[PDB]
Amino acid sequence: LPAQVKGLAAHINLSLSQDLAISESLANSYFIEQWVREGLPEERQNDIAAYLARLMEQLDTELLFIAAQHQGRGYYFQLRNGEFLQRIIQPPGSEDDWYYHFTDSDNAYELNLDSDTFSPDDAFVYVNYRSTVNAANGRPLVVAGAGLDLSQMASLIDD
Amino acid sequence: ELPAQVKGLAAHINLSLSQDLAISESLANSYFIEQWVREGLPEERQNDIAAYLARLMEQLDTELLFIAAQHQGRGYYFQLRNGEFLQRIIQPPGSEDDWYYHFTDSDNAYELNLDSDTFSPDDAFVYVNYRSTVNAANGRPLVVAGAGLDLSQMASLIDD
Numbered sequence: 335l336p337a338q339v340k341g342l343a344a345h346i347n348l349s350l351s352q353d354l355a356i357s358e359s360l361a362n363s364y365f366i367e368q369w370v371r372e373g374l375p376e377e378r379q380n381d382i383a384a385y386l387a388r389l390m391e392q393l394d395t396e397l398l399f400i401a402a403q404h405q406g407r408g409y410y411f412q413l414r415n416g417e418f419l420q421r422i423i424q425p426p427g428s429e430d431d432w433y434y435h436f437t438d439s440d441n442a443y444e445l446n447l448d449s450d451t452f453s454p455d456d457a458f459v460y461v462n463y464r465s466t467v468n469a470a471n472g473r474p475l476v477v478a479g480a481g482l483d484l485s486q487m488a489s490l491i492d493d
Numbered sequence: 494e495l496p497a498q499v500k501g502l503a504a505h506i507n508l509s510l511s512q513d514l515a516i517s518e519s520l521a522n523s524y525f526i527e528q529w530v531r532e533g534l535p536e537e538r539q540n541d542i543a544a545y546l547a548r549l550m551e552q553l554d555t556e557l558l559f560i561a562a563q564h565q566g567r568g569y570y571f572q573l574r575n576g577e578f579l580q581r582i583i584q585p586p587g588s589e590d591d592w593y594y595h596f597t598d599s600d601n602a603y604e605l606n607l608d609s610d611t612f613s614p615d616d617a618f619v620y621v622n623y624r625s626t627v628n629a630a631n632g633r634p635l636v637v638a639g640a641g642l643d644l645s646q647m648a649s650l651i652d653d
């Protein structure tokens with residue numbers, strides 16, 4: 335664990351004051367939790383996307399994501415470039431191993447450099463923040479946050 | 494005024510507003526709050542609004558959160574404080590609600606206003622007054638929202 339790679343990782347952590355605060359409020363959102371408690375009804379996805387789009391106006395991130403527990407399964411949603419994308423989280427051993435590794439930890443949040451699951455040729459530093467509320471299976475009810483490219487992270491280093 | 498004596502003081506308040514400012518901005522511009530205002534502030538959904546604010550207050554460690562919403566030309570003031578959801582109508586200019594007209598008449602996205610409280614006048618706070626980007630028909634922001642900070646919370650946020 336060389337000193338220069340601790341400093342880079344530590345320096346990035348200290349830089350993201352606003353993205354971390356919003357990721358925590360999104361993961362713990364009462365509005366999002368209501369939607370999850372209702373069974374993730376498709377009819378309200380436009381409201382969820384508009385809620386996330388409002389947050390992205392405040393932030394300077396490439397994407398916002400929600401990973402919600404429903405009936406024992408994980409449902410992954412993402413707002414990116416105005417499009418609301420969704421898919422089901424896959425079993426362990428597949429491209430969604432980020433979700434099981436984070437939720438198995440005791441960390442309230444983590445910064446994860448990973449390839450994207452909708453566009454694998456893209457990569458981001460994801461702010462994975464867990465909700466305080468857990469589902470019946472022990473997984474967090476909601477894992478949510480932002481995806482940051484290098485340009486946005488470089489602007490946070492300056493500030 | 495007198496800078497050098499307040500310069501040590503001034504740095505201390507900025508550490509007070511790193512998280513409280515970000516959440517105040519997201520609350521004022523909240524799509525969830527906006528929908529409620531667009532629906533006419535129906536009383537049936539106040540429990541949802543109060544539960545929504547309770548999540549935010551757990552994150553920030555602040556004494557109070559407030560919402561000042563425009564509806565049919567009048568301002569409606571709501572506050573969550575110590576688990577209680579308080580509400581009243583904003584009064585005309587020249588009264589104790591001059592903070593609202595002075596702020597909304599300005600061009601500032603937000604302001605810090607040291608003022609006595611309108612529900613409990615014996616209390617005072619530094620209020621983070623943040624305006625929504627969307628405006629009502631009268632030109633005032635659809636929503637002004639934010640947190641009220643005591644000295645104790647600011648003194649702790651000072652050390653950090």
Ligand SMILES: Nc1nc2[nH]cnc2c(=O)[nH]1
Nearest residue numbers: 432446448449450451460
């Ligand atoms: N690939 C990937 N997608 C995510 N979406 C949210 N967090 C992550 C993550 O850590 N990795």
Ligand SMILES: Nc1nc2[nH]cnc2c(=O)[nH]1
Nearest residue numbers: 592606608609610611620
């Ligand atoms: N008295 C008072 N109450 C507020 N509630 C929200 N902002 C303010 C303010 O500036 N003054």
